[PDB]
Amino acid sequence: NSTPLRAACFDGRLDIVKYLVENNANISIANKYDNTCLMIAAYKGHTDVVRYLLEQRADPNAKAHCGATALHFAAEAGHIDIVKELIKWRAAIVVNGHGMTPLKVAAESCKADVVELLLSHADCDRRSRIEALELLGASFANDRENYDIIKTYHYLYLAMLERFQDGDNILEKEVLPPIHAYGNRTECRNPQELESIRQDRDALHMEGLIVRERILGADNIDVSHPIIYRGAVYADNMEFEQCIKLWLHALHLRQKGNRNTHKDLLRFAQVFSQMIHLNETVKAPDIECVLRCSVLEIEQSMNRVKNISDADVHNAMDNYECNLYTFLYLVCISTKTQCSEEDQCKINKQIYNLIHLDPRTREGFTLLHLAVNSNFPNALVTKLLLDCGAEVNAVDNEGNSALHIIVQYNRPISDFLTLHSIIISLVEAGAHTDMTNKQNKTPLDKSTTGVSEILLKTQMKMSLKCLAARAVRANDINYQDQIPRTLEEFVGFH
Amino acid sequence: MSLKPRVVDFDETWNKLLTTIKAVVMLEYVERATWNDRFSDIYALCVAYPEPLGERLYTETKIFLENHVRHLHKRVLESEEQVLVMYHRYWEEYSKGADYMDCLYRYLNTQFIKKNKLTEADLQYPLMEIGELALDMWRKLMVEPLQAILIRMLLREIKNDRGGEDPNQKVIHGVINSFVHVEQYKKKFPLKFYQEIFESPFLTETGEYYKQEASNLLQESNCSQYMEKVLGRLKDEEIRCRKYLHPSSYTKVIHECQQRMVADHLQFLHAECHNIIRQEKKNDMANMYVLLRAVSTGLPHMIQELQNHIHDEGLRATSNLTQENMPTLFVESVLEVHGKFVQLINTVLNGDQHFMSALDKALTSVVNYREPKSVCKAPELLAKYCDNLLKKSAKGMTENEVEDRLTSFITVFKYIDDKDVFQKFYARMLAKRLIHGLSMSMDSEEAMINKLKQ
Amino acid sequence: MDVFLMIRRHKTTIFTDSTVFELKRIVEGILKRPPDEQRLYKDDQLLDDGKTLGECGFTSQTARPQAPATVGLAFTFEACIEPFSSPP
Amino acid sequence: LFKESEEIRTPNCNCKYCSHPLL
Amino acid sequence: MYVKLISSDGHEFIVKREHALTSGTIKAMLSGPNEVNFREIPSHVLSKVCMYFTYKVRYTNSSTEIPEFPIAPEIALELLMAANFLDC
Ligand SMILES: [Zn+2]
């Protein structure tokens, strides 16, 4: 639904814009998300393009698909000249579908001077002014790159003074209950507490986090990003426990927000990989249990999402393989980290909950199939998967089984103990040695490494069932309606 | 011949198999040929082309087994005061029958129930094999409805055994072993039934009874008489455990009995400890040691009293002679004390590390004492002893006996705290005797120099 | 040593595993009958007692376990091999 | 050290809060 | 020591007990209230499964080579079916 006028406004060429406008350019027509040329130019800060389109009787109070306006995006991108021009052209204060005003938008985006101008705007109330200043301070407290402790304290103190500016009525903050994930600190209500905590930089980060959670909690806003940055800094500080709790709260909010978190889970597993590598781990398996349960819920929900709309889940399908890889890494960590009886019980509970529903992938790989092949070739991961109810006889899209892939393992001499342990574990609990895959084949025939050949050959137990199945399959004799129904599958196996 | 699947009348084959199983589970005689044909009948039922009748077979076997166990339960409950014997008889019969009929449903146990039984992960986080199914519903409908009666009879009979009367060992061992075999295959915590239903009540009753017995014995008998009595009762408890209970509970029962026996009255033993240590009662020494080897409270006070007695006796023996002018007397007295207490420890205390450590502490307190006017007199006396052994002293002395004296002196020298003063005295007297030339032999002096090296 | 033989007596067929006489002693141990009252026949050709089992023609090549060779057994005068059921 | 979440937005919709997946 | 396998046809196959105790079904049939007599298995199938028992004891766990069992095409189906009955 894009128009060449919109592209010209995106580029910023004034001459092209004026030439097209004088040649019957359509402005009221917007894109698929209903975005006007004025509003995209305002988001891009082209003062000349915006002031000419306003002169051309183009609607400044346009409402996007989410209710946001040009003033909203100009405030978000910190274009003071644009918001000033729009106010000159009487841009009305509009609350978007996200429940936020351009004043509040500039407050969240740390555009302090835009906030100043919008407060200078006449149509502002005391409550909106206070909330804008509080949100500005809170965002400055936890900003990734525009961080400033001095600005944070100044704006929060000014907001709190405005709360206490009137003797007859004092506005008291509707503070949220303290969060253990945040650290159980409670947002301040009086100027004295803020003056006490301004000395502690971490305490003011805490206060900003609480203010952001309170202000943006009701609205449908992704508030995890400041939590992401805060936890990243804490991990850089070796304070993993508070970092872990912060990312746990971020994942919970994302689950509330129904947003994809494959990257978040990948990072929250990569941090475990690194902190295992440094050997400073002292990892707590009970915490990993919460991660496993959360990723199980997320993967089940997104699998349902893929089932609902297959046409739009190709990226979601890729995130599905990514999530399964992250779970493989979590099992690797669980092998790395010793667990208590209850902790290991909960880990196995979550793993079994995953296994009970069969998580088919592209090419039909199951958990154990992923665990055995090169993604490497983890051993205790496969053993735990088998112990947790995975199927050794599970069939891939190509038709292979668990043993097929593992015997087809390159570099056998290295990690020979892993290969031997995997073979011994899998042949126990129901691995059929001669499962033909695709065209008639033998897992012994498929294997190309002599040592693995000797291993399974020693592990072979012969039976009339296998030998006679091979003979009947080779002779192509009709077997249906003359064989027990259970053995009908067995005949197809060979 | 017709090994291929056939249209099998489930009613007729089930009716014949019902007559067969009724004899099999009740241990009635069934012909071998009939058994061999019932195997083929089971295979035919498990595989019929119109619809596999295996599920109906399992359901009907469940109903028959339910009727059997309910009838057994009603016959057992109708009997009074013979519940244990009656239950043991039917437990033997039913265990044999359930082990046999597991074979008779082998194909149905490894091709139909196996592919539909819940996996280990399923149970860890209603369709299960027919062989254990009999045991499982035996649990459900024989012991569970009668667990109170069974535990009451078992506990009363074991209490009677502790009283002195001898009950049927086979029947009691059978009922407790049944309390385990009924859950013999659960893949996790096989003793859960046992620990829940017999162990806890048995442990509680043993604790109460032995508290009463310990109080009665302490009131009745003196410290000695009480203590050999409580050793004998512990041994009899081990015997009773071996006779009746499952082996895994022996340690728990013994621990509870001993903690209710001596740990309850450790104050009495500790009070008698001083008198019994200082007044030699070697037999009661060993008995006290074996009694308090288990309870942690007893041992340290034993150690302290032994060390105090050793120190007192050794210090007294050393202080009997003062300025004897013959340091060999002091060394000989110390050696006699050390040997006496070492042999006492190895005899009654079995050479315990703690007791020998206490002996070493007490002996170190002796010798290295400032009570004599000359401080640090012990290294000087040791030096005088060594010189007298080495110096000629106008006497012909056996080299082997001198070596024995030096070897004995090695121990007391190891016990002395300070050796630098002794080393200085050694250097001075060695220079003196080399100047005067009075010595038994250079090699003998060299040998004790080597003895000093080790 | 690598000999497995089908000793057949009409319907009966026992499975054994180098002396003919010790084979007859095994026939004693199984069928419970005196040794000299029974005569062996390789494809209805008499085999003299006390000879080496290998010389008569049974060896690791032709007495393999998956395809044992057949020796006729008759109680002293012959009483014939009864063949198996026909394959459907 | 750390890599921030990408958060590169859909060009069609300019509302930063709106999260439109890009194929 | 020796178990008499009897086919439905009427043959009496006798093999060492340890040879026949390699199938769960035979162990089950010999346990609980010798002379095991299949009323279902025909003669040739029982002969093939009997030769299998001797084949299991020798030439197994052999690193050099383990000979493949020769199964005729016509008997393959009911031999495979007997495999289930005998639970080999
Ligand atoms: Zn097979």
Residue numbers in the entry:
A (entry chain D): 121 to 495, 509 to 627
B (entry chain A): 1 to 125, 135 to 463
C (entry chain B): 1 to 17, 22 to 79, 84 to 87, 89 to 97
D (entry chain H): 568 to 590
E (entry chain C): 17 to 49, 58 to 112
Reproduce text from the manuscript describing this model:
CRL2FEM1B is an oligomeric E3 ubiquitin ligase composed of CUL2, FEM1B, ELOB, ELOC, and RBX1. FEM1B is the substrate recognition protein of the oligomeric CRL2FEM1B E3 ubiquitin ligase that has been implicated in sex determination, apoptosis, colon cancer and Alzheimer’s disease. Cullin-RING E3 ubiquitin ligases (CRLs) are multi-subunit complexes composed of a catalytic Ring-finger protein, a cullin scaffold protein, substrate adapter proteins, and a substrate recognition protein. Here, we describe for the first time the cryo-EM structures of oligomeric CRL2FEM1B in three different states as follows: unneddylated CRL2FEM1B, dimeric neddylated CRL2FEM1B complexed with BEX2, and monomeric neddylated CRL2FEM1B complexed with FNIP1/FLCN.
To determine whether the ubiquitylation strategy of this asymmetric N8-CRL2FEM1B dimer is applicable to other substrates, we obtained the stable N8-CRL2FEM1B-FNIP1-FLCN complex and its cryo-EM structure. We compared our structure with a previously reported structure of unneddylated CRL2FEM1B and noted that neddylated CRL2FEM1B-FNIP1-FLCN exhibits an additional density in the canonical FEM1B substrate binding site. The map also shows that the FNIP1/FLCN heterodimer forms multiple contacts with CUL2-RBX1 and FEM1B. While the neddylated WHB domain of CUL2 and RBX1 provides a platform for the E2s and fixes one side of the substrate, FEM1B (as a substrate receptor) has three additional major binding sites for the other side of the substrate. In addition to the central part of FNIP1degron (residues 579–585) forming Zn2+-binding motifs with the FEM1B N-terminus as recently reported, FNIP1 (residues 568–574) also interacts with the α-helical region in the FEM1B C-terminus. Furthermore, the N-terminus (residues 1–26) and the C-terminus (residues 536–593) of FEM1B appear to be involved in binding the FNIP1/FLCN complex. These results support the following hypothesis: multiple regions of interactions between N8-CRL2FEM1B and FNIP1/FLCN complex are needed to orient the FNIP1/FLCN complex relative to N8-CRL2FEM1B, and fill in the gap between RBX1 and FEM1B. According to SEC-MALS analysis and MP experiment, N8-CRL2FEM1B-FNIP1-FLCN has a molecular weight of 427.7 kDa and 380 kDa, respectively, which corresponds to a combined calculated molecular weight of monomeric N8-CRL2FEM1B and monomeric FNIP1/FLCN heterodimer (201.4 kDa and 195.8 kDa, respectively). For proteins with large scales like FNIP1/FLCN complex, substrates capture the monomeric state of N8-CRL2FEM1B and fill in the gap between RBX1 and FEM1B.
